[PDB]
């Protein structure tokens, strides 16, 4: 199906305690493959998947070069942004950046994106044409005009539609086992008494990949949307994800309820009946 490569960058200022903490991570889909942390003794871009360890010394030298250069850029951006919002020197502040490429089912470019944030809020985003910018507020319109005149989007487009998708495809092929194959959810239901007349039915999905999933509870075929507590999908730590959905029901009526599981890894959508 569809695939993506994305790079996330965070730079956090540390008043009175030296340079900003810079952290970069790379993902293909829901799998992390590289990282850089400015506080590690390494001082290098590091592999975080087996399939990226196929890359030779040149990859690790060049990516370390580039991510260090980006580190330095966001260090300056921190100072710049502090001035733009007339903030004092007392507090810590954060610049974040994200970009990357989506390919469709065919493995040909589908979408590109490139955005910043400052202290959590949106700052500037490359618009979907890859040729204009959406400034979030005014101060970002400064950045809009400079980058427009310097032809920043153009080259961004050349990476987005070039090097980005081309290396995604190389990673997709090199990590085939990890990235083109799925883990189907392992599913079950649990029951917990709340009172003598109410009980919680919880529906579990475990060891699934990718993260995208839908868990719903029905009563007599009717969706129980309003009463379903869903937890946020969460990493298991072995490359797979977990999720549950729960509903409180009247004691003695559990057999009315079914759990429904939609996931790419399942050949067809799954119905779990509490009482078969």
């Amino acid at each position: 199906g569809s695939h993506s490569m994305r790079y996330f960058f965070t730079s956090v200022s540390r008043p009175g305690r030296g340079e900003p903490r810079f952290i970069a991570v790379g993902y293909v889909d829901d799998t992390q493959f590289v990282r850089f942390d400015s506080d590690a003794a390494s001082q290098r871009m590091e592999p975080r998947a087996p399939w990226i360890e196929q890359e030779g010394p040149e990859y690790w030298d060049g990516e370390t070069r580039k991510v260090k250069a980006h580190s330095q850029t966001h260090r300056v951006d921190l100072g710049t942004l502090r001035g733009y919002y007339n903030q004092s020197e007392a507090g810590s502040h954060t610049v974040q950046r994200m970009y990357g490429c989506d390919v469709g089912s065919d493995w040909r470019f589908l979408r590109g994106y490139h955005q910043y944030a400052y202290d959590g809020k949106d700052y500037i985003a490359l618009k979907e044409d890859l040729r204009s910018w959406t400034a979030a507020d005014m101060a970002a319109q400064t950045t809009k005009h400079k980058w427009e005149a310097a032809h920043v989007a153009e080259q961004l487009r050349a990476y987005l539609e070039g090097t980005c998708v081309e290396w995604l495809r190389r990673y997709l092929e090199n990590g085939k086992e990890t990235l083109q194959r799925t883990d189907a959810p392992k599913t079950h239901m649990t029951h917990h008494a709340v009172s003598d007349h109410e009980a919680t039915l919880r529906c579990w999905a475990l060891s699934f990949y990718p993260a995208e999933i839908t868990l719903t509870w029905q009563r007599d075929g009717e969706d129980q949307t309003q009463d379903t507590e869903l937890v946020e999908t969460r990493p298991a730590g072995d490359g797979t994800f977990q999720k549950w959905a729960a509903v409180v029901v009247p004691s003695g009526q559990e057999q009315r309820y079914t759990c429904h599981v939609q996931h790419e890894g399942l050949p067809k959508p799954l119905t779990l009946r509490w009482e078969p």
Partner: peptide
Amino acid sequence: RTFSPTYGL
């Protein structure tokens, strides 16, 4: 592969 160019805010 990361994007090569620099260019601050």
